[PDB]
Ligand binder design. Structure first.
Ligand SMILES: [Mg+2]
Ligand SMILES: [Mg+2]
Ligand SMILES: [Mg+2]
Ligand SMILES: [Mg+2]
Ligand SMILES: [Mg+2]
Ligand SMILES: [Mg+2]
Ligand SMILES: [Zn+2]
Ligand SMILES: [Zn+2]
Lengths: 103, 218, 343, 132
RNA sequence: AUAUACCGCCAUCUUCAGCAAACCCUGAUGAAGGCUACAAAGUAAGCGCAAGUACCCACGUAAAGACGUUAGGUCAAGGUGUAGCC
């Protein structure tokens, strides 16, 4: 569904709970500190890559300016600065799209 | 809730069981509780309890002595009124017979013989899964024969068990909850402590029984 | 022959060879292992090559209130049942051999970020569901003996916490890994340290200390700062319930000493109410988000002191040239500020 | 160190039966012989036949009541008539039990040309002598 | 072929007396250690020793003799894992 009713739906609640979405994701990378630049994208030519970010694996989700209670979870409620892609675990392309949406 | 009311009623009152009447510094000085070992046997943590020194010997401050003794007696009597289990320890063989006899007379229990390893810590494995370990420990002799702290103060401080030990100049009152400075070695002092404790716990018991009988009437 | 044949348990023993020099000495072998199987449980006793239908055991004795009689299973349904049994055995072997997915903690082949679940219930009855466990470190200790030579003993260190300011570490040693885990878990749930915290997510003030040549400097930080500390410290903070701070370890590195010093410090930290009752003044907090506004933290429970503290000018205070550099900005290091993962 | 009809000591999680815990030097001292015949006595004969046939019988019965037995067999040959005694578990049904009982009894009778009978005692779970 | 895959069966120290699951404690919660009886932290399942049984006794002799070492011997009592002739 293009609208945001997928979030009010119960499957979101049971699939996530009260915690944010990024809290579940984890990155596979080299040893110690991970790289500073995330992957370019999770989908290519309608082909998904292993260990994709949550917004990309859940195709029912939609990056949209209007889904306020959705996208409020990345930027901290205590500090207006958005989290960075190495933090929230998402790829750079969807991160940029989300920056444009939030702006 | 009336049970909690009865449990809490004695708390607000100070000297509610009338324990101060038992002891007086006259009696302590007569029983020679004010004595202490030599300065060589002196202990740092015991310094502030020493009133002074005379003839390479030590003397205890009887005001502090009476204060700590009043506190100890009040605590023991409150716990006896709360039915809290009490256990005596005195590794000194000089008074084991007397201590066991007075323990029988009180109804509370004692252990003057050799203390076995992990008696209280592993007490569940030793005795059984469910055993009500004692709620109060007291010490007529804190140090053992070779003069280091008995394992009981340590394991009691571990398992959060309250302790009431009489501390001589050699003893370490750090772990003790209600340490009473005095003369561990003198028989007059031993007999005085035993009489005071038995009278106090018996008063607490009989007061509990008469109060609960009054409430059964009401 | 039939007499030369023999039963299954000794056969499996001799075939698997768990004993002998292989297993002894710890030499083992190069990652070859035959898994035990049970064939008697699989097939029911009735069927064979020639499928006589048995009213006694293979078919129900009575049907339609009529005793049955011996009959023949034709080859078509015989092959059908044989293919069904082949498929069933294949499914059994598949279900047996599969992946094992223990959540990735600090790294693969490391027992760092893994939790063993709550401690075991007590004998008298003590539900420890509130506690979460974590394994900080495990190593293969070896001590030698006359006859058997090297004797290996797994040593493990664990931590436990509510997430509510109460937590505790412990150590366990045993010949078996699971046994050491259990021992240390029980030891930890018995040994608990409580520590206060300022606003449910921070320590009260900065703590610098040394312990067995292991220096630690942990620094309070405000909300939304994150946990930038040693990974063991991150696990311990997650157990305790504090969500953000900073910390730098200096000198040696040894997680058990580190933990013991950390708990010593977090226990020796002073609360604001206790500090007020000690000093005799009102605490005053000033924020950057909030303007020049004094936020009262705690007041002395006793009577307030009449005179204020004299201003301490050019105070005698020892500090760290590292913090001086970080404050002055002349420091340069690529490793300081990185875009690391969540906490 | 001898290894003969004795179970290795484990940590204490191995249920073991009376005879399986006891050693082969406790045969007459603290055990009984599973079989009872007279071929072993002096002057008699056919003892080799007795042994081979009783081994065959033990194997056949173990394999025709598989997964239900929990102990060794007892053989009792009084002159002509042969008697068997077993201990089993109540896993399978009495239908199964009686059917296979009759089956094996008839087989033994026709094989040995001898009158055969067997008895079996049920137990909920195997009786353990010790934990080794 | 592999006893350097093993079971099964045994030599060995053994003409030993220790081995120990499960708990507690000390060492700053390190590898490790835990003995003082006019007693100071050790408690102990179980195995073994021992005891009892066999020969003529209660002694003696047999028997028994754990945990482990020699990658000890034995794929040739027998079977079996792996690799081969088929
Ligand atoms: Mg890896
Ligand atoms: Mg021999
Ligand atoms: Mg060999
Ligand atoms: Mg011999
Ligand atoms: Mg013997
Ligand atoms: Mg060899
Ligand atoms: Zn993506
Ligand atoms: Zn003295």
């Amino acid at each position: 569904d293009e609208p945001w009713k997928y979030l009010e739906s119960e499957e979101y609640q049971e699939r996530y709970g009260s915690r944010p979405v990024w809290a579940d994701y984890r990155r596979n990378h080299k040893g110690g500190v991970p790289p500073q630049r995330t992957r370019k994208t999770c989908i290519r030519r309608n082909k998904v890559v292993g260990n994709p970010c949550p917004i990309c694996r859940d195709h029912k989700l939609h990056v949209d300016f209007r889904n306020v209670k959705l996208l409020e979870q990345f930027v901290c409620a205590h500090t207006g600065i958005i989290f960075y892609a190495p933090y929230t675990g998402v790829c750079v392309k969807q991160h940029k799209r989300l920056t444009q949406a939030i702006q | 809730d009336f049970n909690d009311k009865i449990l809490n009623e004695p708390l607000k009152h100070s000297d509610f069981f009338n324990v101060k009447e038992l002891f007086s510094v006259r009696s302590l000085f007569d029983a020679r509780v004010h004595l202490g070992h030599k300065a060589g046997c002196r202990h740092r943590f015991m310094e502030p309890y020493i009133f002074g020194s005379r003839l390479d010997h030590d003397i205890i401050d009887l005001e502090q002595t009476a204060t700590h003794l009043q506190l100890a007696l009040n605590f023991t009597a409150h716990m006896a009124y709360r039915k809290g289990i009490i256990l005596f320890i005195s590794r000194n063989r000089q008074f084991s017979y007397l201590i066991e006899n007075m323990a029988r007379d009180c109804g509370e229990y004692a252990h003057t013989r050799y203390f076995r390893g992990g008696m209280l810590t592993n007490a569940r494995l030793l005795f059984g899964p469910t055993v009500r370990l004692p709620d109060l420990i007291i010490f007529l002799h804190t140090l053992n024969n070779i003069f280091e702290p008995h394992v009981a103060v340590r394991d009691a401080a571990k398992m959060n068990i309250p302790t009431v030990g009489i501390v001589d100049t050699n003893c370490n009152p750090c772990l003790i909850t209600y340490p009473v400075p005095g003369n561990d070695d003198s028989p007059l002092a031993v007999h005085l402590y035993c009489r005071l404790f038995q009278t106090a716990i018996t008063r607490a018991k009989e007061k509990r029984q008469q109060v609960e009988a009054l409430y059964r009437l009401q | 022959s039939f007499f030369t044949k023999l039963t299954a348990d000794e056969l499996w023993k001799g075939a698997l060879a768990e004993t002998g020099a292989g297993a002894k000495k710890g030499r083992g072998k190069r990652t070859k292992k035959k898994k035990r199987k049970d064939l008697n449980r699989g097939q029911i006793i009735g069927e064979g090559r020639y499928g006589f239908l048995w009213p006694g055991l293979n078919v129900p004795l009575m049907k339609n209130g009529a005793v049955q009689t011996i009959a023949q299973r034709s080859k078509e349904e015989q092959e059908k049942v044989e293919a069904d049994m082949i498929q069933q055995r294949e499914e059994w072997d598949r279900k047996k051999k599969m992946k094992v997915k223990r959540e990735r903690g600090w790294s693969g082949n490391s027992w760092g970020g893994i939790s063993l679940g709550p401690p075991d219930p007590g004998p008298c009855g003590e539900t420890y569901e509130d506690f979460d466990t974590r394994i900080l470190e495990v190593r293969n200790v070896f001590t030698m003996t006359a006859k058997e030579g090297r004797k290996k003993s797994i040593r493990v260190l664990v931590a436990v916490g509510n997430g509510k300011g109460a937590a505790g570490f412990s150590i366990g040693k045993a010949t078996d890994r699971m046994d050491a885990f259990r021992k240390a878990k029980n030891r930890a749930v018995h040994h608990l340290h409580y520590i206060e915290r300022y606003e449910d997510h921070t320590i009260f003030h900065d703590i610098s200390l040394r312990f067995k040549r292991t220096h630690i400097k942990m620094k309070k930080q405000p909300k939304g700062y994150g946990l930038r500390c040693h990974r063991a410290i991150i696990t311990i903070c997650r157990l305790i319930g504090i969500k953000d701070m900073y910390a730098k370890v200096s000198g040696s590195i040894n997680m058990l000493s580190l933990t013991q010093g950390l708990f010593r410090g977090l226990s020796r930290q002073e609360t604001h109410q206790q500090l007020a009752d000690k000093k005799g003044l009102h605490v005053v907090e000033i924020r950057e988000e909030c303007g020049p506004l004094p936020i009262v933290v705690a007041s002395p429970r006793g009577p307030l002191r009449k005179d204020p503290e004299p201003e301490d000018e050019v105070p005698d205070v020892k500090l760290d040239w590292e913090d001086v550099k970080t404050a002055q900005g002349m420091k340069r290091s690529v490793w300081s500020n990185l875009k690391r993962a969540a906490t | 160190k001898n290894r003969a009809a004795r179970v290795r000591v484990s940590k204490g999680d191995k249920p073991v039966t009376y005879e399986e815990a006891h050693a082969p030097h406790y045969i007459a001292h603290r055990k009984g012989w599973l079989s009872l015949h007279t071929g072993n006595l002096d002057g008699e004969d056919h003892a080799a036949e007795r042994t081979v046939e009783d081994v065959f019988l033990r194997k056949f019965m173990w394999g025709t009541f598989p997964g239900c037995l929990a102990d060794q067999l007892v053989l009792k040959r009084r002159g002509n008539q042969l008697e068997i005694c077993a201990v089993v578990l109540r896993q399978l049904s009495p239908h199964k039990y009686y059917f296979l009982v009759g089956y094996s009894e008839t087989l033994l009778s026709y094989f040995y040309k001898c009158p055969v009978r067997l008895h079996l005692q049920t137990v909920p779970s195997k009786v353990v002598y010790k934990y080794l």
